């Protein structure tokens, strides 16, 4: 009962006896009134057959014992309910007194056959062992009714597996490619191990969003379809290392996913209430400082890649003119605020290392127009966060930073084709316009992870519309097809571009297109009801000053050390039993040319290997 250390037994004891604790305490009428309530509450398990109401040193009686003609109903009875509640402190607390034949002293404990980091090796390991020559792993929705696995073998993508109905909606990679997150409508699964099976699965239905912390430790699941799974905790956070639901947070209405945003380290997690920013903390998903930050009018918020900072912004809110705020955490201080004044919208673009925050700002004159776009760049390594005001120009529709660097590319509207502007860092300081190119169909700027190559893409156009630029000093290499292009992705090290046409987006061609950085198409493979393509992530495993030095070793001119040896190995792959088969192929092409000739001459017919359109 009453003592602040007191509890019922923590497992079942002997089967036959009811122990109920913190009963209605003795006083006027209460003693016989206790029987009067007990023989209604406990009579639904069967009729009371013995009752024992002891007293102890003359102190008021906290517990009673009850027995039944069928005794083994008692083990159900103290499982069937606990906590049923009468007056005052009387909240009936149920147990069976201790076993005396069995004991709880030591067990066999707990096996695990394998865990998550094995298929991190089953990314890197496979990249070493496998013979080819020379690239990335997929990740294809489309060939056939199957979720399917491919390499990039230069000649074709070779298919490794095609698995029938693996996902019931969409399939998502883990950040290093370690797990595959597969949606099943009866619970999200993490498919692990080298040959792919479920190692972990999380029961949440109504889910459509299924995304990781960027450091692979936590999974966040969101149901836009309410069930009674959520009630009403629709944002559910699952810990991958334990395998457990750590939190649910109640549902949402605004805006784009992720609505709940992680820091880079995965230390902090947060969501906006419009009148208050709430900040939640790893490892247990607590509440930082035991507080939430009462700041009003926030229109979006973006975490820095650098430890540990949020950029957020407020438009004109009643008494408050518009501003962009840089806030440091866990201190929670608005370290750099700049009021921007009379803005239709703004977009907050971090550089990839946290070095700079560029803000794209659209300002309003008294005619109520989006008259001019400005670029204003905060510098975060530099003392007291100085600000590069850079640009003034008409209708900027896109902006993108150089990955891992400091250059950027910009698109302007209404000329009447889209104009492209290119920006570099000056040796005297400041970042400034350096080049432009004539107006085009490109609406999307998509840069290589290796910094040099930028794609200018007219996504969701029937034709053309992909243009390719090498950088520094931005020079156009190539322009190519992709009929009804929707989807676009790069190799993590910038060698290959893949672009696709999802059947969710478009239905006049449906395909994936695979292309080498140069201006050489590898292949385009039409696919019958094409759903999706995603490369498996492959981060460079370690990086260091000596690796950065080895990259500079040949000083710039040409080099001839590696590729010529791989081409020599490929040249060896045309030899030894190979020669007889090369001869066969040849003899066949010749036989065919001979008949091809004769038929053109004799009856004017062109031979073929498939029935023409």
């Amino acid at each position: 009962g009453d003592v602040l250390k007191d509890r019922p037994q923590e497992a079942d004891g002997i089967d036959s006896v009811i122990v109920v604790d913190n009963v209605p305490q003795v006083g006027p009428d209460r003693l016989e009134k206790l029987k009067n309530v007990i023989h209604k509450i406990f009579s639904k398990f069967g009729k009371i057959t013995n009752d024992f109401y002891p007293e102890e040193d003359g102190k008021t009686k906290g517990y009673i014992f009850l027995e039944y003609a069928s005794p083994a109903h008692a083990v159900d009875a103290v499982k069937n309910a606990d906590g049923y509640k009468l007056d005052k402190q009387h909240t009936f607390r149920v147990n069976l007194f201790t076993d005396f034949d069995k004991y709880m002293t030591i067990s066999d404990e707990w096996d695990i056959p394998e865990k998550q980091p094995f298929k991190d090796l089953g990314n890197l390991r496979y990249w070493l062992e496998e013979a080819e020559c020379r690239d990335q792993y997929s990740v294809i929705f489309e060939s056939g009714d199957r979720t399917s696995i491919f390499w990039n073998d230069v000649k074709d993508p070779v298919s490794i597996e095609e698995r029938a109905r693996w996902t019931e909606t969409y399939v998502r990679w883990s950040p290093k490619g370690t797990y595959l997150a597969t949606f099943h409508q009866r619970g999200i699964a993490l498919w692990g191990g080298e040959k792919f099976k479920q190692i972990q699965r999380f029961s949440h239905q109504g889910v459509q969003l299924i995304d990781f912390s960027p450091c692979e430790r936590y999974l966040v699941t969101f149901s836009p379809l309410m069930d009674t799974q959520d009630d009403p905790q629709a944002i559910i956070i699952w810990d991958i290392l334990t395998g457990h639901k750590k939190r649910g947070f109640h549902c949402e209405s605004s805006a784009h996913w992720p609505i709940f945003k992680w820091s880079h380290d995965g230390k902090f997690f947060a969501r906006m209430t419009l009148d208050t920013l709430s900040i939640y903390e790893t490892p247990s998903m607590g509440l930082l400082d035991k507080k939430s930050l009462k700041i009003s009018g926030i229109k979006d918020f973006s975490w820095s890649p650098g430890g540990n900072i949020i950029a957020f912004w407020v438009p004109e809110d009643k008494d408050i003119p518009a501003r962009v705020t840089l806030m440091q955490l866990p201190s929670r201080q608005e370290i750099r605020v700049r009021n921007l004044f009379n803005v239709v919208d703004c977009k907050l673009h971090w550089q990839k290392n946290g070095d700079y925050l560029c803000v794209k700002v659209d300002r309003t004159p008294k005619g109520t127009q989006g008259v001019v776009t400005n670029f204003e760049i905060f510098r975060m390594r530099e003392k007291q966060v100085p600000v590069d005001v850079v640009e003034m120009k008409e209708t900027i529709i896109a902006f993108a930073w150089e990955p891992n660097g400091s250059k950027f590319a910009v698109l302007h509207g209404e000329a009447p084709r889209i104009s492209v502007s290119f920006y570099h860092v000056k040796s005297n300081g400041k970042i400034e316009l350096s080049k432009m190119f004539d107006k085009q169909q490109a609406n999307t700027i998509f840069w290589s992870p290796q910094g040099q190559f930028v794609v200018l893409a007219g996504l969701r156009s029937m034709n053309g519309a992909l243009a390719f630029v090498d950088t520094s000093d931005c020079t156009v290499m190539n322009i190519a097809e992709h009929y009804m292009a929707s989807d676009v992705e790069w190799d993590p090290t910038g060698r290959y571009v893949v672009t696709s046409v999802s059947w969710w987006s478009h239905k006049v061609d449906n395909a994936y297109w695979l292309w080498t950085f140069q201006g050489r198409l590898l292949q385009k493979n039409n696919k019958d009801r094409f759903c999706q393509l995603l490369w498996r992530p492959r981060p460079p495993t370690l990086l260091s000053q000596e690796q950065i030095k080895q990259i500079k070793k040949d000083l710039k001119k040409y080099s001839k050390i590696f590729e010529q040896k791989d081409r020599l190995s490929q040249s060896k792959a045309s030899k030894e039993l190979v020669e007889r088969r090369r001869a066969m192929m040849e003899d066949f092409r010749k036989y065919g040319k001979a008949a091809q000739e004769l038929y053109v001459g004799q009856k004017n017919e062109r031979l073929e290997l498939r029935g023409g359109v």
């Binding site: 294809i140 060939s143 056939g144 009714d145 199957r146 399917s148 491919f150 073998d153 230069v154 000649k155 074709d156 993508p157 070779v158 298919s159 095609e162 029938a164 050489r520 493979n525 696919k527 490929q570 792959a573 045309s574 190979v578 088969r581 090369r582 066969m584 192929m585 066949f588 036989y591 008949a595 004769l598 038929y599 009856k603 017919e605 031979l607 073929e608 290997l609 498939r610 029935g611």
Partner: protein
């Protein structure tokens, strides 16, 4: 590939065929009605009813306007594909074992079996067609020519037309192939002696300039039309009923098998009559595709090379759609040579 199973026929299959655009599949069996199926999903479009005997052969014209059937009931029928009605019947003094349209649809040949005292023959019929609608205007009750079993050969069992209808190629019950010159009043041109058993199938490449033979003697030969040179030999340990040349890829599909008879089959081993894929040029077995409960009697490939169908002595048709692993299947020297292009 993915396979689904079409059931309609309760009797052993005798022939399956795709149409020119590869969206319909036609089949006949030892039942007296033929079926038409959508090749996309295996849905049954309808049936061809009117024969009273096994239908041995079915063919569909290049327009998909008519199909023709040959029957054990001693008749050939011409059917209108859009309503399934019979528009012409010819009576035969003997069963008809095979029928095929000329490449442009104005003639069909029919193999008349050598039964009772008939020596057998390949009959050629003419369909005069409206040049716009390709509907028929006239059929004659007589064939316009009869190639009677040539002196020294046994009766023909299979026949087809080469490119532009300039030759008829035939296979015979004594393992020979013979060739007839259509311009020159179908005169005998030449023959080769290939198999120790009857020729059980013969099918053409997509351009009709070469063909592939099969026999229950376990061998299959790829043969050039103009020379009758044998180009390739595929050697098996299995009696063959049927064979095809694939479009798109350089593959051959062969099919046959030996009925089990007296030996017990376990549930683990049930459903293992297969089609064998060979590389056309290297003559090497590259795959076996299981699924049938008795010998394969007929195989057909779509002209787009994107699916194939097989019909079994088990009374089922398995319909196969190729997947990405099939389209990308390549020997190392084939990857090399395809890249040498650029």
């Amino acid at each position: 590939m993915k396979a689904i199973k079409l059931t309609g026929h309760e009797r052993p299959l005798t022939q399956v065929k795709y149409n020119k655009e590869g969206d319909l599949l036609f089949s006949c069996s030892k039942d007296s009605s033929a079926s038409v199926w959508y090749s996309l999903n295996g849905e049954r479009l309808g049936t061809l009813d009117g024969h009273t005997g096994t239908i041995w052969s079915i063919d569909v014209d290049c327009f998909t306007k008519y199909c023709v059937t040959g029957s054990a009931d001693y008749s050939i029928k011409l059917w209108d594909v859009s309503n399934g009605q019979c528009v012409a019947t010819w009576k035969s003094p003997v069963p008809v074992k095979r029928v095929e349209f000329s490449p442009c649809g104005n003639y069909f040949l029919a193999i008349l079996d050598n039964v009772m005292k008939n020596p057998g023959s390949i009959n050629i019929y003419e369909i005069e067609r409206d040049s716009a609608t390709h509907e028929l205007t006239k059929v004659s009750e007589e064939p316009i020519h009869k190639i009677i079993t040539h002196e020294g050969l046994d009766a023909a069992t299979v026949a087809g037309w080469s490119t532009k209808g300039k030759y008829i190629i035939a296979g015979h019950k004594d393992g020979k192939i013979s060739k007839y010159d259509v311009s020159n009043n179908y005169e005998y041109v030449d023959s080769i002696d290939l198999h120790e058993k009857s020729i059980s199938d013969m099918q053409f490449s997509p351009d009709l300039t070469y063909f592939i033979t099969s026999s229950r003697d376990t061998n299959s030969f790829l043969v050039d039309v103009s020379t009758l040179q044998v180009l390739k030999k595929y050697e098996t340990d299995c009696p063959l009923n049927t064979a095809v040349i694939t479009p798109l890829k350089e593959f051959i599909i062969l099919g046959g098998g030996q009925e089990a008879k007296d030996v017990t089959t376990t549930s683990a081993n049930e459903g293992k009559f297969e089609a064998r894929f060979y590389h056309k040029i290297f003559e090497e077995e590259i795959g076996r595709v299981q699924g049938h409960f008795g010998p394969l009697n007929t195989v057909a490939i779509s002209p787009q090379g994107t699916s194939y169908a097989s019909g079994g002595e088990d009374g089922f048709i398995r319909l196969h759609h190729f997947e990405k692993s099939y389209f990308d299947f390549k020997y190392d020297v084939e990857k090399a040579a395809e890249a040498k292009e650029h």
